[PDB]
Scaffold this active site. Sequence first.
Site, mmCIF file in Angstrom:
data_model
loop_
_atom_site.group_PDB
_atom_site.id
_atom_site.type_symbol
_atom_site.label_atom_id
_atom_site.label_comp_id
_atom_site.label_asym_id
_atom_site.label_seq_id
_atom_site.Cartn_x
_atom_site.Cartn_y
_atom_site.Cartn_z
ATOM 1 N N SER A 117 1.197 -1.119 0.173
ATOM 2 C CA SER A 117 0.545 0.141 0.086
ATOM 3 C C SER A 117 0.874 1.132 -0.363
ATOM 4 O O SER A 117 1.518 1.051 -0.850
ATOM 5 C CB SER A 117 -0.789 -0.222 1.050
ATOM 6 O OG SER A 117 -2.012 1.089 1.334
ATOM 7 N N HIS A 147 -7.462 -5.044 -2.113
ATOM 8 C CA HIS A 147 -6.663 -4.723 -0.815
ATOM 9 C C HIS A 147 -5.473 -4.828 0.350
ATOM 10 O O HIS A 147 -4.099 -5.346 0.531
ATOM 11 C CB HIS A 147 -6.840 -2.923 -0.323
ATOM 12 C CG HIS A 147 -5.598 -2.162 -0.426
ATOM 13 N ND1 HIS A 147 -4.765 -1.417 -1.305
ATOM 14 C CD2 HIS A 147 -4.819 -1.497 0.422
ATOM 15 C CE1 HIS A 147 -3.899 -0.948 -1.334
ATOM 16 N NE2 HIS A 147 -4.210 -0.749 0.572
ATOM 17 N N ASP A 151 -9.618 -3.700 -6.109
ATOM 18 C CA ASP A 151 -8.869 -3.127 -4.903
ATOM 19 C C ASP A 151 -9.651 -1.842 -4.691
ATOM 20 O O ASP A 151 -10.277 -0.958 -6.006
ATOM 21 C CB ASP A 151 -7.397 -2.858 -5.542
ATOM 22 C CG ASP A 151 -7.294 -1.660 -3.591
ATOM 23 O OD1 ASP A 151 -7.224 -1.256 -3.879
ATOM 24 O OD2 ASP A 151 -5.863 -2.302 -4.105
#
Length: 261
Positions: free
Chosen positions: A132, A210, A178
Site C-alpha cells: 500500500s 487491497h 482493490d
Amino acid sequence: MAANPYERGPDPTEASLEASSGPFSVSETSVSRLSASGFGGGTIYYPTTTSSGTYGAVAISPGYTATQSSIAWLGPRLASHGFVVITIDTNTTFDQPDSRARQLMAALNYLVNRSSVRSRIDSSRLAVMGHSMGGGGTLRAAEDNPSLKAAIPLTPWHTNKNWSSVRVPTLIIGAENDTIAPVSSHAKPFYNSLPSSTPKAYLELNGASHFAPNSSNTTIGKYSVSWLKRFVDNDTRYSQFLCPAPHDDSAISEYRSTCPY
Ligand code: NA
Ligand code: NA
C-alpha cells in the site's frame, strides 16, 4: 561449482515455490524502535545456515495505519528461500510514501552495518518491498537508489503516477478488486510508466482485495521469491517462472513462435 556464485538452494520447482516454506531453516531476531536509526524497529528473519555463503537482504514496509503484523508472513516465507528479511515498523503509522521510502533504506543500512546478522549479508545485493503506501515508498526508494537489485510494490498507493526514472527491476502486484488503491489509478499507471528497458512485470491477483498481501498468499509468495532470486541473486534458474515457455520442458530443446495467438 555453479558459475553463478550467488545461487542458493536446490533447483526450483513450482511445488517448492508454492509451499509455505523454502529449503532453508529460518531464525529471527528483533531491533527495537529506540535502536533503529531512521525507522521504527522491525523483525529480522534470516537463514540459520551460513555454510553456502552470504545472502541478499530485503526490507519490507507496511501501509498506512499498519504495523509489521500486516506483513509478518513475508518474513519467514522469503527468508526460507535464502534471504535476510526485515519487516519494519514506521516512525509513525501515518507516514506518507516518501517517508517510508527513506525508512526502507535506513532499515537496509541498519541490516548491513549494525545488525547482529550483518555478516550473513552481501551488502551489494539489496531489495525493497512494501504494501500500500509502503509499496509507494518502494517505488520511490527504487527511483532514488538505482543500486538496488529489485523492488516489489504490493498493491501500491502513491499520488505520483510517473515512475519513468526507475532503473531497478520492479514487479508490481495489484489486486483486481482493490478499492483503496484501485489498479486503474495506481498499480497499472505505475507499471505503464516504468521504462521498457527496465526488467519489469505486473501481476494482478484475480478477485483480490487491497488486503490480500496481509495474509499468506501462494501467488505472492511464488512470484516474489522468483523475482528476488532472479535479480537479487542473478539466479536465472527462476526465469522459467517469470517468463514461461514450452522449452522449459526437458523434452523440448527449443521453441519459437509468433505468439500471442
Ligand atoms: Na527509531
Ligand atoms: Na501474434
